[PDB]
Amino acid sequence: PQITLWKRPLVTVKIEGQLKEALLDTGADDTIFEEMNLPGRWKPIIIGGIGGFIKVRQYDQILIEICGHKVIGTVLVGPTPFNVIGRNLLTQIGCTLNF
Amino acid sequence: PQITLWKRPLVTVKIEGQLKEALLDTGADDTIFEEMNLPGRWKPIIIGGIGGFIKVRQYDQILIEICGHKVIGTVLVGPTPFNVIGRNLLTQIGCTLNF
Ligand SMILES: CC(C)CN(C[C@@H](O)[C@H](Cc1ccccc1)NC(=O)O[C@H]1CO[C@H]2OCC[C@H]21)S(=O)(=O)c1ccc(N)cc1
């Protein structure tokens, strides 16, 4: 689908049987989510953004279904004010910016 | 132009005679830049991100030239680690996400 930018690019995602809206963020290298449980072992990491840094739990090989499209990749879990889909996953769906 | 997301969507920008690379950020409501002087008065404001908050000087009706396209709108100046082009300006060029 084509998405304009007059409103926040929210999309519903299915991840670990959980339904959530997520922000298609081209400014995000990686995908981070609010607190929720996921499969496998994880590494603690710190990510930097506007205003400072936050500690998050790093998880690899996470299944997310995004607007009917399937993807697997790294998903970080931490105190983000919003769920964002970063570029690590936007690529796999062939998402592009266009103007 | 069509832009893939395997690398950061950086673009060269011209703003107040200054050349700058900026991040096309669909996760950014507004456009912010690192410290720089711009003409006229400004209002102090606070913006929120993943790491926390920062105070920035708000300027309205700012001319920015982006990859050959011209736009005018609000541009904030503050301690961002990167210059980002938020949705307040991404719309005016008719930028869209596509997958
Ligand atoms: C700091 C930059 C490199 C931009 N980043 C993504 C960006 O889209 C954030 C994503 C974002 C969105 C909402 C809240 C926090 C962070 N946008 C943002 O900070 O927006 C603020 C300026 O315009 C306003 O719009 C809303 C918040 C304000 S980031 O959050 O820090 C980031 C960096 C690395 C990763 N892996 C994931 C996210």
Side-chain angles (χ1 to χ4, degrees), chain A residues 1-42 44-54 56-99, chain B residues 1-6 8-13 15-40 42 44-54 56-99:
Chain A
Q2 174 183 278
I3 303 181
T4 61
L5 301 169
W6 305 97
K7 55 184 180 297
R8 260 154 175 171
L10 291 171
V11 295
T12 55
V13 306
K14 188 160 76 150
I15 174 173
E16 191 67 16
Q18 298 176 242
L19 315 181
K20 295 191 178 283
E21 275 198 278
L23 189 68
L24 307 181
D25 192 352
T26 56
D29 307 323
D30 313 305
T31 296
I32 168 164
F33 278 71
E34 53 197 6
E35 178 55 54
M36 60 186 300
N37 202 347
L38 299 178
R41 197 154 162 244
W42 57 274
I45 63 167
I46 318 280
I47 60 181
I50 242 150
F53 276 71
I54 56 164
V56 307
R57 309 193 316 268
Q58 177 183 3
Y59 294 80
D60 290 7
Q61 314 154 95
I62 296 304
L63 179 66
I64 304 193
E65 194 172 353
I66 296 164
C67 195
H69 307 238
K70 292 166 149 78
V71 291
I72 283 172
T74 309
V75 173
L76 319 165
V77 184
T80 178
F82 286 90
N83 313 322
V84 312
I85 306 311
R87 299 187 296 102
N88 70 315
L89 301 182
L90 295 166
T91 54
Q92 293 180 35
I93 64 176
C95 185
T96 58
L97 286 165
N98 305 77
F99 65 96
Chain B
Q2 178 183 282
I3 302 181
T4 61
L5 300 169
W6 304 98
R8 276 158 188 174
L10 291 171
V11 295
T12 56
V13 176
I15 174 172
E16 192 67 17
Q18 298 175 59
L19 314 181
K20 296 191 178 283
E21 274 198 278
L23 189 68
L24 307 181
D25 192 351
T26 56
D29 307 323
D30 313 305
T31 297
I32 168 164
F33 279 70
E34 309 228 46
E35 181 56 55
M36 64 184 301
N37 200 348
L38 300 180
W42 48 270
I45 63 169
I46 317 280
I47 57 183
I50 234 159
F53 77 89
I54 50 101
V56 307
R57 313 198 320 268
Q58 178 183 3
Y59 296 82
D60 290 7
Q61 313 148 268
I62 299 304
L63 178 65
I64 302 194
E65 192 172 353
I66 297 163
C67 194
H69 303 55
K70 292 165 149 77
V71 291
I72 283 172
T74 310
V75 175
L76 320 165
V77 182
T80 178
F82 294 78
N83 312 321
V84 312
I85 305 310
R87 298 186 295 102
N88 70 315
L89 301 182
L90 295 167
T91 53
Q92 293 180 35
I93 63 176
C95 185
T96 58
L97 285 165
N98 306 77
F99 65 97

